[PDB]
Short mmCIF file of C-alpha atoms and ligand atoms in Angstrom, two decimals:
data_model
loop_
_atom_site.label_atom_id
_atom_site.label_comp_id
_atom_site.label_asym_id
_atom_site.label_seq_id
_atom_site.Cartn_x
_atom_site.Cartn_y
_atom_site.Cartn_z
CA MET A 1 -17.72 -115.97 96.31
CA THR A 2 -20.70 -117.54 97.18
CA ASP A 3 -21.66 -115.15 99.93
CA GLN A 4 -21.71 -112.06 97.69
CA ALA A 5 -24.11 -111.40 94.64
CA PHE A 6 -25.59 -109.04 92.21
CA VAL A 7 -29.23 -108.71 92.98
CA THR A 8 -32.04 -107.54 90.57
CA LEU A 9 -35.96 -107.36 90.25
CA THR A 10 -38.38 -107.79 87.82
CA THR A 11 -41.98 -107.77 88.68
CA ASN A 12 -43.36 -108.76 85.15
CA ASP A 13 -41.97 -109.79 81.99
CA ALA A 14 -40.91 -106.87 80.16
CA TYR A 15 -38.59 -106.27 83.10
CA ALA A 16 -37.53 -109.99 82.76
CA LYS A 17 -36.07 -109.45 79.69
CA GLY A 18 -33.99 -106.71 81.03
CA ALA A 19 -33.35 -108.95 84.13
CA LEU A 20 -31.72 -111.71 81.46
CA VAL A 21 -29.70 -109.19 79.51
CA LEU A 22 -28.45 -108.07 83.05
CA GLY A 23 -27.63 -111.28 84.00
CA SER A 24 -26.05 -112.62 80.92
CA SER A 25 -24.13 -109.28 80.86
CA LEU A 26 -22.57 -110.11 84.16
CA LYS A 27 -21.77 -113.37 83.15
CA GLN A 28 -19.93 -112.16 80.04
CA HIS A 29 -17.95 -109.85 81.99
CA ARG A 30 -16.92 -112.84 84.45
CA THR A 31 -18.41 -112.02 87.45
CA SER A 32 -17.07 -114.20 90.28
CA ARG A 33 -20.24 -113.38 92.31
CA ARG A 34 -23.72 -115.22 92.48
CA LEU A 35 -26.47 -113.82 90.49
CA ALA A 36 -29.76 -113.35 92.26
CA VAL A 37 -32.97 -111.93 90.61
CA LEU A 38 -36.21 -111.07 92.83
CA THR A 39 -39.39 -112.07 90.96
CA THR A 40 -43.04 -111.48 91.47
CA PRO A 41 -45.44 -114.00 90.66
CA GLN A 42 -46.74 -112.06 87.52
CA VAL A 43 -43.39 -113.25 85.79
CA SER A 44 -44.63 -116.02 83.59
CA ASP A 45 -42.82 -119.56 83.69
CA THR A 46 -40.96 -119.13 80.65
CA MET A 47 -39.32 -115.90 81.82
CA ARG A 48 -39.12 -117.55 85.03
CA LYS A 49 -37.53 -120.67 83.59
CA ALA A 50 -35.05 -118.43 81.48
CA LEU A 51 -34.48 -116.54 84.92
CA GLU A 52 -33.76 -119.96 86.69
CA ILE A 53 -31.10 -120.52 84.00
CA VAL A 54 -29.00 -117.12 83.71
CA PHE A 55 -29.59 -116.42 87.46
CA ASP A 56 -28.03 -118.88 90.50
CA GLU A 57 -30.93 -117.67 92.48
CA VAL A 58 -34.59 -116.72 91.53
CA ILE A 59 -36.76 -115.49 94.50
CA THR A 60 -40.31 -114.77 94.37
CA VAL A 61 -41.44 -111.97 96.01
CA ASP A 62 -45.37 -111.46 96.36
CA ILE A 63 -46.09 -108.52 98.20
CA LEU A 64 -49.79 -108.87 96.92
CA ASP A 65 -49.93 -111.98 99.55
CA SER A 66 -51.03 -110.71 103.17
CA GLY A 67 -48.19 -113.42 104.37
CA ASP A 68 -45.60 -110.63 103.05
CA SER A 69 -43.95 -108.36 105.62
CA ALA A 70 -44.45 -105.43 103.01
CA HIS A 71 -48.06 -106.35 102.47
CA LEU A 72 -49.23 -104.07 105.48
CA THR A 73 -47.15 -101.26 104.00
CA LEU A 74 -48.61 -101.76 100.22
CA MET A 75 -52.13 -101.38 101.48
CA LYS A 76 -51.07 -98.07 103.44
CA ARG A 77 -49.05 -97.08 100.01
CA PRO A 78 -49.78 -98.88 96.95
CA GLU A 79 -47.68 -96.47 94.79
CA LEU A 80 -44.77 -98.13 96.57
CA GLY A 81 -45.67 -101.65 95.54
CA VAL A 82 -42.29 -102.04 93.27
CA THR A 83 -40.14 -100.21 95.83
CA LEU A 84 -41.27 -102.67 98.43
CA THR A 85 -40.55 -105.61 96.46
CA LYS A 86 -37.32 -104.03 95.60
CA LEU A 87 -36.79 -103.76 99.62
CA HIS A 88 -36.99 -107.41 99.77
CA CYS A 89 -33.06 -107.44 98.35
CA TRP A 90 -32.41 -106.45 101.86
CA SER A 91 -34.09 -110.07 103.04
CA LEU A 92 -31.16 -111.96 101.00
CA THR A 93 -29.33 -112.64 104.21
CA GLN A 94 -27.68 -115.72 102.26
CA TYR A 95 -25.44 -112.91 101.01
CA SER A 96 -22.89 -110.89 103.12
CA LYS A 97 -23.11 -108.00 100.50
CA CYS A 98 -24.93 -107.31 97.25
CA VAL A 99 -24.90 -105.06 94.49
CA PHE A 100 -28.41 -104.66 93.51
CA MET A 101 -28.80 -103.40 89.87
CA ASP A 102 -32.25 -102.52 88.37
CA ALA A 103 -33.31 -104.68 85.69
CA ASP A 104 -32.82 -101.91 83.28
CA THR A 105 -29.13 -101.59 83.37
CA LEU A 106 -26.73 -103.29 81.40
CA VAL A 107 -22.91 -104.25 82.45
CA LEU A 108 -20.29 -103.47 80.23
CA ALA A 109 -17.40 -104.39 82.19
CA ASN A 110 -16.31 -106.67 85.04
CA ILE A 111 -17.58 -104.70 88.35
CA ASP A 112 -16.62 -107.02 90.93
CA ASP A 113 -14.75 -104.06 92.52
CA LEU A 114 -18.02 -102.79 93.78
CA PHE A 115 -17.80 -105.49 96.59
CA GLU A 116 -14.87 -103.91 97.95
CA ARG A 117 -17.60 -101.09 98.86
CA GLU A 118 -20.01 -100.68 101.98
CA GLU A 119 -23.53 -100.18 102.25
CA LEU A 120 -24.49 -97.59 101.06
CA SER A 121 -22.64 -97.14 98.13
CA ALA A 122 -24.35 -95.77 95.24
CA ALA A 123 -23.60 -93.60 92.24
CA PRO A 124 -24.98 -89.64 92.14
CA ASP A 125 -28.58 -89.10 90.46
CA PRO A 126 -28.27 -86.65 87.53
CA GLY A 127 -30.62 -84.06 88.02
CA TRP A 128 -30.38 -83.98 92.28
CA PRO A 129 -26.59 -85.08 92.60
CA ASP A 130 -27.22 -85.08 96.12
CA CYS A 131 -29.29 -88.03 95.87
CA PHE A 132 -27.45 -91.27 94.68
CA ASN A 133 -29.60 -93.13 92.05
CA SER A 134 -30.81 -96.35 93.11
CA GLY A 135 -30.37 -98.26 89.75
CA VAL A 136 -27.13 -99.75 91.24
CA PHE A 137 -26.10 -99.68 95.04
CA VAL A 138 -24.12 -101.63 97.33
CA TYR A 139 -26.01 -103.16 100.28
CA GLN A 140 -25.78 -105.57 102.96
CA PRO A 141 -28.64 -107.82 103.14
CA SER A 142 -30.09 -107.67 107.10
CA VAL A 143 -33.38 -108.30 108.08
CA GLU A 144 -33.20 -105.64 110.26
CA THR A 145 -32.26 -102.96 107.57
CA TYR A 146 -35.01 -104.44 105.77
CA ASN A 147 -37.56 -103.84 109.00
CA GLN A 148 -36.04 -100.29 109.28
CA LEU A 149 -36.69 -99.60 105.67
CA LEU A 150 -40.64 -100.93 105.58
CA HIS A 151 -40.97 -98.60 108.74
CA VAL A 152 -39.87 -95.67 106.91
CA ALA A 153 -41.73 -96.57 103.58
CA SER A 154 -44.93 -96.69 106.05
CA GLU A 155 -44.23 -94.03 108.13
CA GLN A 156 -42.84 -91.34 105.66
CA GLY A 157 -43.50 -93.04 101.95
CA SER A 158 -41.18 -91.95 99.71
CA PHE A 159 -40.64 -88.36 98.56
CA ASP A 160 -40.32 -89.43 94.91
CA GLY A 161 -42.95 -92.18 95.15
CA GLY A 162 -40.46 -94.78 94.31
CA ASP A 163 -37.33 -96.79 95.56
CA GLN A 164 -34.81 -93.81 95.21
CA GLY A 165 -36.76 -91.33 97.46
CA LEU A 166 -37.08 -94.24 100.27
CA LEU A 167 -33.66 -95.42 99.92
CA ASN A 168 -32.07 -91.79 99.82
CA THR A 169 -34.29 -90.73 102.91
CA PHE A 170 -33.35 -93.53 104.44
CA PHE A 171 -29.53 -93.44 103.55
CA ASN A 172 -29.38 -90.13 104.00
CA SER A 173 -26.09 -89.22 104.86
CA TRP A 174 -24.85 -90.03 101.43
CA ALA A 175 -24.40 -86.70 99.85
CA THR A 176 -22.06 -85.42 102.68
CA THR A 177 -20.49 -88.28 104.07
CA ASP A 178 -17.53 -90.66 102.78
CA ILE A 179 -16.60 -90.08 99.08
CA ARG A 180 -16.30 -94.05 98.64
CA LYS A 181 -19.76 -94.49 98.96
CA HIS A 182 -20.27 -92.18 96.14
CA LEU A 183 -19.77 -95.11 93.22
CA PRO A 184 -18.19 -93.58 90.25
CA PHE A 185 -20.83 -92.46 87.69
CA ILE A 186 -19.51 -94.83 85.04
CA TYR A 187 -21.25 -97.41 87.48
CA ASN A 188 -24.57 -96.36 86.59
CA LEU A 189 -24.03 -94.11 83.75
CA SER A 190 -27.58 -92.77 82.86
CA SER A 191 -28.54 -92.97 79.50
CA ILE A 192 -30.01 -89.86 79.33
CA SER A 193 -26.45 -88.05 80.30
CA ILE A 194 -25.40 -89.78 77.24
CA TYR A 195 -26.65 -86.93 75.28
CA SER A 196 -27.85 -84.58 78.54
CA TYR A 197 -24.26 -83.50 79.07
CA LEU A 198 -22.68 -84.96 75.76
CA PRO A 199 -18.94 -83.50 75.91
CA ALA A 200 -18.47 -85.06 79.41
CA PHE A 201 -20.05 -88.45 77.91
CA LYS A 202 -17.28 -87.77 75.24
CA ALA A 203 -14.53 -87.29 77.86
CA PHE A 204 -15.47 -90.03 80.22
CA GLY A 205 -18.04 -92.51 78.89
CA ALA A 206 -15.90 -94.69 77.08
CA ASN A 207 -15.02 -95.65 80.59
CA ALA A 208 -18.78 -96.87 81.40
CA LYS A 209 -18.76 -99.97 83.44
CA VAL A 210 -22.93 -99.79 83.71
CA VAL A 211 -25.35 -98.37 81.60
CA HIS A 212 -28.47 -97.29 83.14
CA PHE A 213 -31.24 -97.47 80.81
CA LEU A 214 -33.59 -94.38 82.11
CA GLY A 215 -36.71 -92.81 80.31
CA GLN A 216 -40.14 -94.30 79.61
CA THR A 217 -38.61 -95.99 76.40
CA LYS A 218 -36.72 -99.11 77.59
CA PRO A 219 -34.21 -101.15 75.70
CA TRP A 220 -36.96 -103.63 75.04
CA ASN A 221 -39.35 -101.29 73.72
CA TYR A 222 -37.39 -100.32 70.92
CA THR A 223 -37.01 -102.16 67.37
CA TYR A 224 -33.83 -103.92 66.78
CA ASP A 225 -32.86 -104.83 63.03
CA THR A 226 -30.76 -107.98 63.41
CA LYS A 227 -29.54 -107.33 60.31
CA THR A 228 -27.82 -104.03 60.43
CA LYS A 229 -27.49 -105.26 64.43
CA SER A 230 -29.05 -101.60 65.33
CA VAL A 231 -32.07 -100.13 66.95
CA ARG A 232 -34.20 -98.18 65.01
CA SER A 233 -35.43 -94.49 65.59
CA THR A 234 -29.70 -91.18 68.83
CA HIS A 235 -26.77 -92.61 70.21
CA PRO A 236 -27.59 -95.93 70.14
CA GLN A 237 -24.42 -97.80 71.25
CA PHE A 238 -25.60 -99.13 74.23
CA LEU A 239 -29.25 -99.85 73.06
CA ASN A 240 -27.32 -101.77 70.49
CA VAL A 241 -25.02 -103.82 72.98
CA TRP A 242 -28.31 -104.58 75.09
CA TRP A 243 -30.07 -106.01 71.80
CA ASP A 244 -27.01 -107.70 70.95
CA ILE A 245 -26.87 -109.77 74.34
CA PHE A 246 -30.81 -109.96 74.27
CA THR A 247 -30.79 -111.42 70.55
CA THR A 248 -27.47 -113.61 70.93
CA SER A 249 -28.40 -114.92 74.42
CA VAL A 250 -31.53 -114.34 75.61
CA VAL A 251 -33.89 -115.21 73.06
CA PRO A 252 -32.38 -118.46 72.05
CA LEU A 253 -32.52 -118.99 75.88
CA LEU A 254 -36.22 -118.35 76.05
CA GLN A 255 -36.38 -120.31 72.53
CA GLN A 256 -35.73 -123.67 73.98
CA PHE A 257 -38.37 -123.65 76.19
CA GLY A 258 -40.97 -124.25 73.18
CA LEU A 259 -39.85 -127.58 73.18
CA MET B 1 -13.02 -60.85 106.35
CA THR B 2 -10.75 -58.27 104.47
CA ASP B 3 -8.96 -61.17 102.79
CA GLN B 4 -11.74 -63.57 101.54
CA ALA B 5 -14.04 -62.36 98.61
CA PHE B 6 -16.90 -63.61 96.63
CA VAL B 7 -15.66 -62.97 93.08
CA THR B 8 -17.86 -63.16 89.97
CA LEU B 9 -17.03 -62.19 86.27
CA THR B 10 -18.97 -60.20 83.76
CA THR B 11 -17.83 -59.87 79.98
CA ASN B 12 -20.46 -57.72 78.89
CA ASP B 13 -23.60 -55.59 79.92
CA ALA B 14 -26.15 -58.43 80.26
CA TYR B 15 -23.94 -60.48 82.58
CA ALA B 16 -23.24 -57.03 84.39
CA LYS B 17 -27.06 -57.23 85.35
CA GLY B 18 -26.59 -60.67 86.73
CA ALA B 19 -23.34 -59.60 88.87
CA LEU B 20 -25.13 -56.61 90.12
CA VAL B 21 -28.00 -58.75 91.31
CA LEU B 22 -25.40 -60.99 92.73
CA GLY B 23 -23.55 -58.98 94.60
CA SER B 24 -26.85 -57.15 95.58
CA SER B 25 -27.96 -60.46 97.05
CA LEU B 26 -24.65 -61.03 98.86
CA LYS B 27 -25.21 -58.09 100.62
CA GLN B 28 -29.05 -58.42 101.14
CA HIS B 29 -27.85 -61.80 103.16
CA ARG B 30 -25.25 -60.09 105.04
CA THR B 31 -21.75 -61.30 104.01
CA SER B 32 -18.92 -60.43 105.85
CA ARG B 33 -16.83 -61.09 103.02
CA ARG B 34 -15.72 -58.90 100.17
CA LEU B 35 -17.41 -58.70 96.81
CA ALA B 36 -15.12 -58.56 93.69
CA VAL B 37 -16.06 -58.51 90.25
CA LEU B 38 -14.00 -59.35 87.10
CA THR B 39 -14.84 -57.12 84.09
CA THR B 40 -13.81 -56.72 80.52
CA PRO B 41 -13.64 -53.56 78.67
CA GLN B 42 -16.68 -54.54 76.89
CA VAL B 43 -18.79 -53.67 80.22
CA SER B 44 -20.18 -50.05 79.16
CA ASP B 45 -19.42 -46.89 81.71
CA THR B 46 -22.48 -47.03 83.58
CA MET B 47 -22.69 -50.77 84.42
CA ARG B 48 -19.05 -50.45 85.37
CA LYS B 49 -20.02 -47.36 87.74
CA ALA B 50 -22.87 -49.70 89.01
CA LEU B 51 -20.52 -52.33 89.75
CA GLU B 52 -17.96 -49.82 91.51
CA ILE B 53 -20.91 -49.51 93.98
CA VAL B 54 -22.31 -53.17 94.61
CA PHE B 55 -18.47 -54.64 94.70
CA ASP B 56 -15.79 -53.38 96.73
CA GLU B 57 -13.53 -54.33 94.33
CA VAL B 58 -13.92 -54.27 90.29
CA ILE B 59 -11.02 -55.94 88.02
CA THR B 60 -10.84 -55.29 84.62
CA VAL B 61 -9.67 -57.85 82.44
CA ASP B 62 -8.65 -57.57 79.03
CA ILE B 63 -7.38 -60.82 77.33
CA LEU B 64 -7.53 -59.32 74.01
CA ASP B 65 -4.80 -57.17 75.16
CA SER B 66 -1.39 -58.62 74.01
CA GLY B 67 0.05 -57.54 77.72
CA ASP B 68 -2.38 -60.08 79.47
CA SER B 69 -0.98 -63.70 80.29
CA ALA B 70 -3.97 -65.32 78.95
CA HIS B 71 -3.80 -63.38 75.51
CA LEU B 72 -1.38 -66.09 73.91
CA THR B 73 -3.81 -69.07 74.77
CA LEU B 74 -6.62 -67.01 73.66
CA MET B 75 -4.92 -66.71 70.15
CA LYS B 76 -4.77 -70.59 70.15
CA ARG B 77 -7.91 -71.15 71.73
CA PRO B 78 -10.63 -68.34 70.79
CA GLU B 79 -13.48 -70.53 72.23
CA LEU B 80 -11.88 -70.05 75.31
CA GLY B 81 -12.12 -66.51 75.93
CA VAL B 82 -14.74 -66.27 78.73
CA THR B 83 -12.96 -69.47 80.62
CA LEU B 84 -9.61 -67.46 80.38
CA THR B 85 -11.06 -64.41 81.53
CA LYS B 86 -12.79 -66.43 84.41
CA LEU B 87 -9.23 -67.99 85.54
CA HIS B 88 -8.09 -64.80 86.14
CA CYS B 89 -10.29 -64.98 89.22
CA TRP B 90 -6.81 -66.99 90.62
CA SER B 91 -4.95 -63.64 90.17
CA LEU B 92 -6.85 -62.11 92.74
CA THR B 93 -3.91 -62.87 95.49
CA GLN B 94 -5.11 -59.97 97.48
CA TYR B 95 -7.76 -62.89 98.53
CA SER B 96 -6.33 -65.68 100.65
CA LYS B 97 -9.74 -67.87 99.69
CA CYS B 98 -12.51 -66.62 97.72
CA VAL B 99 -15.87 -68.10 96.34
CA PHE B 100 -15.92 -67.70 92.62
CA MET B 101 -19.94 -67.37 91.77
CA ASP B 102 -20.71 -67.08 87.70
CA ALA B 103 -22.98 -64.12 87.34
CA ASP B 104 -25.92 -65.92 86.74
CA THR B 105 -26.16 -67.40 90.12
CA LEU B 106 -28.15 -65.71 92.73
CA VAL B 107 -27.50 -65.72 96.65
CA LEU B 108 -31.15 -66.68 99.21
CA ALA B 109 -29.10 -67.20 102.23
CA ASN B 110 -25.81 -66.29 103.94
CA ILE B 111 -23.31 -68.58 102.22
CA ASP B 112 -20.21 -67.26 104.44
CA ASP B 113 -19.74 -71.25 105.65
CA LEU B 114 -18.47 -71.55 102.26
CA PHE B 115 -14.89 -70.24 103.46
CA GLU B 116 -14.65 -73.22 105.64
CA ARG B 117 -14.12 -75.10 102.38
CA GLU B 118 -10.55 -75.69 100.74
CA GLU B 119 -9.67 -75.78 97.15
CA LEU B 120 -11.57 -76.83 94.90
CA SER B 121 -14.64 -77.34 96.32
CA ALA B 122 -17.73 -77.27 94.01
CA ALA B 123 -21.20 -78.78 94.03
CA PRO B 124 -21.92 -81.53 91.40
CA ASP B 125 -22.91 -80.84 88.00
CA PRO B 126 -26.52 -82.36 87.06
CA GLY B 127 -26.13 -84.10 83.90
CA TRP B 128 -22.82 -85.45 84.68
CA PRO B 129 -22.37 -85.30 88.39
CA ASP B 130 -18.98 -86.76 88.42
CA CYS B 131 -18.12 -83.31 87.49
CA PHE B 132 -18.54 -80.56 89.79
CA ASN B 133 -20.57 -77.49 88.27
CA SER B 134 -17.97 -74.40 87.94
CA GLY B 135 -20.55 -71.92 88.44
CA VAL B 136 -19.77 -72.21 92.53
CA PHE B 137 -16.59 -73.03 93.86
CA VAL B 138 -14.22 -72.10 96.53
CA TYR B 139 -10.69 -71.55 95.50
CA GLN B 140 -7.40 -70.06 96.72
CA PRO B 141 -6.21 -67.39 94.35
CA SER B 142 -2.35 -68.33 93.41
CA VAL B 143 -0.20 -67.34 90.40
CA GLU B 144 1.05 -70.61 90.14
CA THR B 145 -2.64 -72.21 90.01
CA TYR B 146 -3.26 -69.67 87.55
CA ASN B 147 -0.36 -70.23 85.52
CA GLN B 148 -0.97 -74.01 85.70
CA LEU B 149 -4.72 -73.70 84.63
CA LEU B 150 -3.56 -71.60 81.76
CA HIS B 151 -0.86 -73.88 80.88
CA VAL B 152 -3.77 -76.87 81.00
CA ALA B 153 -5.74 -74.56 79.01
CA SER B 154 -3.33 -73.95 76.60
CA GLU B 155 -2.33 -77.46 76.05
CA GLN B 156 -5.42 -79.70 76.61
CA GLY B 157 -8.39 -77.11 75.95
CA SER B 158 -11.67 -77.61 77.48
CA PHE B 159 -13.38 -81.27 76.91
CA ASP B 160 -16.59 -79.42 77.27
CA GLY B 161 -15.35 -75.60 75.52
CA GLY B 162 -15.97 -73.92 78.91
CA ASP B 163 -14.53 -73.34 82.12
CA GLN B 164 -16.06 -76.19 83.30
CA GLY B 165 -14.56 -78.81 81.32
CA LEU B 166 -11.19 -77.00 82.17
CA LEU B 167 -11.46 -76.82 86.16
CA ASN B 168 -12.58 -80.55 86.10
CA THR B 169 -9.59 -81.56 84.07
CA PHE B 170 -7.31 -79.66 86.45
CA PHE B 171 -9.15 -80.41 89.51
CA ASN B 172 -9.88 -84.03 88.56
CA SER B 173 -9.85 -85.44 91.84
CA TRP B 174 -12.99 -83.90 93.12
CA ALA B 175 -15.46 -86.99 91.91
CA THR B 176 -13.36 -89.31 94.01
CA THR B 177 -11.93 -87.24 96.96
CA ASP B 178 -12.64 -85.85 99.92
CA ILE B 179 -16.68 -85.55 100.45
CA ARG B 180 -15.91 -82.10 101.85
CA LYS B 181 -14.97 -80.65 98.54
CA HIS B 182 -18.24 -81.59 97.60
CA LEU B 183 -20.34 -78.74 98.09
CA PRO B 184 -24.18 -79.39 98.67
CA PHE B 185 -26.20 -79.10 95.62
CA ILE B 186 -28.14 -76.32 97.32
CA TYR B 187 -24.89 -73.91 97.07
CA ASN B 188 -25.28 -74.01 93.45
CA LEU B 189 -28.63 -75.26 92.79
CA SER B 190 -29.44 -75.60 88.83
CA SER B 191 -32.58 -73.97 87.82
CA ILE B 192 -33.10 -76.91 85.41
CA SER B 193 -33.23 -79.34 88.63
CA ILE B 194 -36.18 -77.43 90.31
CA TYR B 195 -38.27 -79.21 87.27
CA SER B 196 -35.88 -81.96 86.04
CA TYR B 197 -35.91 -83.73 89.35
CA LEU B 198 -39.23 -81.95 90.80
CA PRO B 199 -39.61 -84.44 93.96
CA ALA B 200 -36.34 -83.96 94.95
CA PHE B 201 -36.74 -80.01 94.57
CA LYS B 202 -40.03 -80.24 96.79
CA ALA B 203 -37.84 -82.30 99.33
CA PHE B 204 -35.12 -80.31 99.17
CA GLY B 205 -35.30 -77.17 97.45
CA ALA B 206 -36.69 -74.83 100.47
CA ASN B 207 -33.20 -75.12 101.54
CA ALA B 208 -31.81 -73.67 98.25
CA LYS B 209 -28.86 -71.37 99.23
CA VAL B 210 -27.85 -70.54 95.66
CA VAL B 211 -29.71 -70.57 92.22
CA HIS B 212 -28.12 -71.18 89.36
CA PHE B 213 -29.80 -70.02 86.40
CA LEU B 214 -28.97 -72.20 83.63
CA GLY B 215 -30.26 -72.41 79.98
CA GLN B 216 -29.93 -70.10 77.36
CA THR B 217 -32.71 -67.91 78.77
CA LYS B 218 -31.16 -65.84 81.30
CA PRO B 219 -33.26 -64.13 84.14
CA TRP B 220 -32.39 -60.76 82.26
CA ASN B 221 -33.94 -62.28 78.85
CA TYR B 222 -37.24 -62.56 80.88
CA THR B 223 -40.13 -59.89 80.93
CA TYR B 224 -40.77 -59.06 84.59
CA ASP B 225 -44.49 -57.28 85.43
CA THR B 226 -43.33 -55.07 88.29
CA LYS B 227 -47.23 -54.72 89.15
CA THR B 228 -47.80 -58.41 89.25
CA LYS B 229 -44.25 -58.92 90.64
CA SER B 230 -43.68 -62.05 88.35
CA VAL B 231 -42.04 -62.94 85.12
CA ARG B 232 -43.96 -63.78 82.24
CA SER B 233 -43.97 -66.79 80.18
CA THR B 234 -42.80 -72.43 84.98
CA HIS B 235 -41.60 -72.36 88.64
CA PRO B 236 -40.89 -68.60 88.40
CA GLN B 237 -40.24 -67.93 92.16
CA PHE B 238 -36.52 -67.82 91.45
CA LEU B 239 -36.49 -65.58 88.57
CA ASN B 240 -38.91 -63.65 90.75
CA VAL B 241 -36.61 -63.10 93.65
CA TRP B 242 -34.05 -62.15 90.99
CA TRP B 243 -36.15 -59.53 89.16
CA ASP B 244 -37.20 -58.10 92.79
CA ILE B 245 -33.49 -57.57 93.60
CA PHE B 246 -33.06 -56.25 89.99
CA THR B 247 -35.72 -54.14 90.42
CA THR B 248 -35.65 -52.94 93.88
CA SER B 249 -32.08 -52.59 93.98
CA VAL B 250 -30.29 -52.32 91.05
CA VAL B 251 -32.42 -50.71 88.29
CA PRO B 252 -32.64 -47.73 91.01
CA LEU B 253 -28.96 -47.76 91.19
CA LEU B 254 -28.38 -47.53 87.43
CA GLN B 255 -30.91 -44.91 86.96
CA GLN B 256 -28.84 -42.49 89.16
CA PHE B 257 -25.75 -42.23 86.77
CA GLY B 258 -28.27 -40.58 84.21
CA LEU B 259 -27.62 -37.40 86.09
CL1 CL C 301 -14.11 -89.33 102.69
#
């Protein structure tokens, strides 16, 4: 399907590693869809070149440029920089439907069945489960929606200073409307929940389709022993999957640009 | 409405305080429904007498007795004692529909509109939000359902050793079926979330209808200064509401049995 895409975002090189692992994981699980990544000019040439290989489409978004539609909102609400960049996912009108996935997620299984879903479909956020988590969502690119989101960003901002507040505000019927727009939690499994509610993880986590690495320590912030194939220090399985992909697929890819 | 009830449970005197505050809070917000409390013989005469005043119905459940239907399951799965006692809420066939509320919840607003809901309606659990939280739920008393729950308890137990695992297992279509069976989070607002996702609380928590005091430190485990009208040590508003009711309504009630 050429009209549908997984879309991620990286604003820097550290999250490009995430993007690259995410993109690799989607190919690993044989997505039939396109892979698109939003990048900023802060993403270096080497990461960018690796992104051009992993992703079918690399889109540059520069909200620091006055030519950007979001730039005015950025001036007004500088804290929303990343949010505003992410919102450009709606500008990808070459696609009829996309699954947005943050660069700190990881695909463990084919999730092409998400394209059955409508905008706005997302998994509940743990913590405040009447908000959906904005790490993974099904949306329809539309200039109009983009404009409407930008407008909300400008007028109200984000109740949480991030994209999740803004998205929840805009798509506010999610909690109370249409159970199909609740993606199963396994499609955006918060890495925190994999110890916060451990009995639940043991009961339902073997079914995890997507892991969302939350907390301040991102996967790339870990040390990974390539001999023991495990990250160093508490349930590292997913970190280890991430690092296996990073070591197996991403690093050698990055390395070939040295020549 | 004489055929509908809020139903809580107390297995001991500490949770009877919770029950009493919960029952008082429901009257404070002018429920038109009956108030029922499941008690065990471990609840002392004084708490029991206070329960007889706050609640319209005080039901004694003694799963330690061989005459109890749950007793055999208790022998088999001793960890489920409290769960099995709670399951007797389904035995309350004098009511057509009930809202079960754990004794560690607190009503902040009339929630009689829960009786519009069907079994099984519950709020999402934070942590694993594709489970519902068993602190507050709308159910239909039925010997059959009780028997079926007991049977599941016996055969599979609880994936989390508590009632929530068992209830989620039995009512397992909740995550993926019927958005109306998702109670808004404000009807079972986890006290943890009131700091775990603080931006969300600031955005949506003023709407809280029910607070669910989770964590090991229950409201009665706090020290309350009756002069400053505040608990001692981090967002104590709800603790303070609980203690205000406890101080204002429950304690003087308890005291009158000294004579
Ligand atoms: Cl629905």
